[PDB]
Amino acid sequence: GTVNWSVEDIVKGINSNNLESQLQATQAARKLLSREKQPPIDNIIRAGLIPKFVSFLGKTDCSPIQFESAWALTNIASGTSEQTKAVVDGGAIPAFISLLASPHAHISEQAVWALGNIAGDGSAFRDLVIKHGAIDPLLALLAVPDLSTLACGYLRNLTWTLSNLCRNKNPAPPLDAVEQILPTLVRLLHHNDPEVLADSCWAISYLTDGPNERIEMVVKKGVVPQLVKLLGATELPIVTPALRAIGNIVTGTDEQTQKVIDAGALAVFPSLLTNPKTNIQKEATWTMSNITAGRQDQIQQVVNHGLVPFLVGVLSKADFKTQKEAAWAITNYTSGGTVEQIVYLVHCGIIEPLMNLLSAKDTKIIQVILDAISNIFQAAEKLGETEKLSIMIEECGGLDKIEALQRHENESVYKASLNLIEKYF
């Protein structure tokens, strides 16, 4: 009979001076907060229960009230920022960090989970969790010879919590905290549980989402080969974060991009660029765009891996957002490529799908495509093949669309269009 209690009854129990009565009421609150239909978090907060639950976290003599209060506070911290703030404002952070040392694994795990909810709110609570010294005790829980001896649920919760300490920007986590965590993350990226791997990849994705210096910290740990392996996994929950991380890395230096290429990434892109999940196709095409923005030798590896036909494919037929990323990939290829490389692109069939996209109701893509046409014409000028290109564009319905564009709202469009017609048509 700790099921379906009223808040009034929970309060009466918790305000009793009877530790057992307090425990029963705390469990009743936990069960309330563990129901799927509108858990009454705000009523619990308004009753003034958070301070009591936090004090129960410190009752080493009564392990069950520690657990029940920990779970109750976890579910409150799971809610809105305001609800998470209430838990923090009750002094929960230092009390949960103390509980990480509990001899009872179920209590340690609950404290891990609660700190994940708190750090997960945002940069400020993440950083406050770090300042109260959570990282050392968290990592100590993973200091075992073989992670496989740890309970599955426990290891997954720890990985998820660590990923939330890696998460959010403005600002990004403290550099020294990232350096402290990364060796353990590297280890978890090699664990064989799909959920640990997914959360480990998500953590790396967050740490790579920033300036080149943040990317370098990750790349210098030697994880890129393992990320490429995970890019080839069957489980979408793994591939999604692995590809985001790879995509983040290739937004860095050409030397950082090369590590991805050297690790064998481009061999997975035939699958990625034809993947049934639209998001994967989008993100893979975005990744390709930042590789085509690289050096000519890097463009050549794209060519050698047979990926230009796949880019023609996505340009020809994909969700609009993927097609725009593909347009970017082409404009980048055309901007940085050799004449021979640009010729290859036309021989693979780029012109018709590019022209077909000029009918789109998106100014940016039109700008991108018009820029790419100009770049191709520039290479044709160097080969004296301007007329052949002009004819191709005319034969596939392009000239009509470019003409219309001379009469377009956007200035860049009409200017770029007018120029092309004036110089080639």
Binding site: T251, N290, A293, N332
Partner: peptide, 5 residues
């Protein structure tokens, strides 16, 4: 060219 996030 330039990369983009």
């Amino acid at each position: 060219p330039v990369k983009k996030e």
